[PDB]
């Protein structure tokens, strides 16, 4: 999540946005809506092969809508989720692949972010009920909760149902990675794209679409280096219910003109430049690192960085980034160049705030702000300078972590930046002497992840055997679950902005307390605490791939219960599939919810198998694959010269 990053990019680079042409259903005089024929050519001018759904962006608006009355129970929420997701698929009309990615158990660095936004939701709910002196807890949208089990069963039904009914899903391969499969929803998509890209049969001109509002999807869309890539998102700025595209192909054109440097001692490569730009944007903040005090998106902090990056690029000897790895020796140039401007940036910020008028105790525009900053925000010794360097090394370690996470997959499931504030650029010293080594670490179980991201007010979603650890004042880990906590606005104006001063979980303590109680879990709960897997769903009308899996798995002359996919028989899908035990195909598709508001299908035309992404030793390369054909340029010489003339300022 990068707040204000979208409002910034769309203002600076306007041509990356275009409206989504959505065909609407015809409504009968009797009221019956006639569904949209999604087999007809896509009215957006192009045909999209793959559509990836960051699914939690659909679950949140349909469960706690801010604009309409909230649904009456979970079943009506699933119905809205069906209607919303169907509307999206009727818009994109994917022709080959459709991935449903629900947030699974995430790395420790993301869990601390999830812990923050979930602790705040509990306090907002308490403060909005004390002002009124059981609703749906938004924190149920968390991996491993009872709510996610309802959602998993509902998406399995709805996909099989659409494979049966909608004639535009015949050749469509549906991949469902539910909340029992570890991995952040954005990065389960990102890892699937990397796996297909490394396939020898892969189409270099695949048209990708990813859905979600998380600004991380823009960065990841750039990190794939698949040119034919769009981001589908709701027109959040609709004040004066539609959707908009964000053309990563066009954003690449804007970054081409924004970053091009004449006369370099080394070869200029737009692909390697985009990587450095993505790396540079980590400094303005995201889910894993705080923004540096000098860098704010609303202050053109990205422009400050790209300026310093262009000034140092000839003398660096090369780029900052190569395929997800950082040359910290070169990154030293960037931070040295920002430290020289920190003093002046804070002053320019105060001069703006003084003209906006015509309490702050740090006073970044006054001499000695660094001693006040660590004294009041980090709440440490201002005289301890080595501590400041440590925070710098911690932040630099985090930059290397996020870059590998985005480009090659999570390098450490246990690492996390252990401070609530960022250091100054002046505090990054001797970065060339760092030797960063990441251990993959231990992935959390669903219940452990729950205890790591939920507050005590949401313990309903947690097995009762653990509740005493969150509420008993004599609990050995009660210091992890405060009922009240301070939120530092840090100069910002709104309450959703700012830092939540929550203690960081010492994970060995939490795991030790949960192990002492695990033998009391029910047999159904022990099974819920185990990792699931991805599944592929196709219809019996999918050419080749359906005939293949019925032969290997469900014929009379069955062979191995797992075989690799040939991308010529499947519609370009690479990887292995495994037979699901206890599953007989073509039975009766039964609607899982109680009120039977969706039909049972007596003969299920769909078939479900376990899907296994390909895993190659060849890393994800930041390059244009052989055989790619770039889209015709969207920017004009007028466009380019405007971006260049402004970039010189
Ligand atoms: Mg994210
Ligand atoms: Mg997410």
Numbering used by the authors: 2 to 134, 159 to 265, 305 to 422, 569 to 859
Question: What did the original publication write about this model?
Answer:
Here, we found that the Xrn2 core from the thermophilic yeast Chaetomium thermophilum (CtXrn2, residues 1–875, molecular weight 100 kDa) fulfills those conditions. To lay the structural foundation for our NMR experiments, we first determined the crystal structure of CtXrn2. The active site of the enzyme is positioned in a pocket in front of the ‘tower’ domain helix (helix α4). Seven acidic residues provide a coordination platform for the two catalytically important Mg2+ ions. In our structure of the Xrn2 enzyme, electron density is lacking for three regions: (1) the top of the tower domain (residues 135–158) that is also less well defined in other Xrn2 structures; (2) the linker region between CR1 and CR2 (residues 423–568) that is highly flexible in solution; and (3) a short loop between residues 266 and 304 that harbors a putative CCHC zinc finger (ZnF) motif. However, in our crystal structure of apo CtXrn2, this XTBD segment is already fully folded, and the chemical shifts of Ile687 and Ile688 δ1-methyl groups clearly deviate from the shift of Ileδ1-methyl groups in unstructured regions. The precision of the extracted population is limited, as can be judged from the shallow minimum in the reduced χ2 surface. Taken together, our data establish that the α1-‘ratchet’-helix of Xrn2 samples multiple states in solution in the absence of a substrate, whereas other parts of the enzyme are largely devoid of motions on the millisecond time scale Fig. 2 Methyl-TROSY NMR reveals conformational dynamics located around the N-terminal α1-helix. In summary, our data reveal that the apo Xrn2 enzyme is in a dynamic equilibrium between the pre-translocation and post-translocation states.
